[PDB]
């Protein structure tokens, strides 16, 4: 709501970061959607250290956004920091409640994210599937 606009006001305006096979993602684009739910998660990086990030759940994507210096930056990890969410699918961890996977089909990837609790894993499990069910098509609405 006004939230986005607070992230946006709170972000460099070149800041910039790839999506693969689409094209560049700025702070413009994030006001082309709707905030449907933010929160801090754990990002497991290759090196397997967990990583602090804002994540955005937005109309079509997923967004990771770092609190680096009182501004907000799109983190350079060997995945894309904004995911599409079209045809994405959640999977558990096995044996850690807190944890799960998100796999996306565009292209194939895996993030692997961990919450705070059983029951926040809940929630956003609850908000991405629903979020991924109703996904707008590409031809009404371009990630670009």
Same mark, same amino acid.
């Given at each position: 709501g006004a939230r986005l606009q607070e992230i946006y006001n709170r972000m460099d305006p070149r800041a910039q970061t790839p999506v693969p096979g689409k094209g560049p993602f700025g @702070? *413009? *684009? #994030?006001? @082309?959607?709707? #905030?449907?739910h933010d929160g801090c998660l754990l990002w497991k990086t290759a090196t397997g250290r967990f990583k602090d990030v804002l994540v955005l759940l937005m109309t079509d994507v997923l967004v990771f956004l770092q609190e680096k210096d009182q501004k907000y930056i799109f983190p350079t990890l060997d995945k894309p920091s904004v995911v599409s969410l079209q045809n994405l699918i959640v999977r558990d961890i096995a044996n850690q409640e807190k944890g799960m996977f998100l796999i996306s089909a565009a292209p194939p990837e895996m993030y692997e994210v961990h919450t705070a609790s059983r029951d926040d894993r809940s929630t956003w499990i609850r908000v991405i599937q629903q979020s991924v069910r109703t996904c707008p098509s590409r031809e009404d609405f371009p990630l670009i």
């Open positions: @702070r *413009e *684009e #994030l006001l @082309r959607r709707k #905030l449907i």
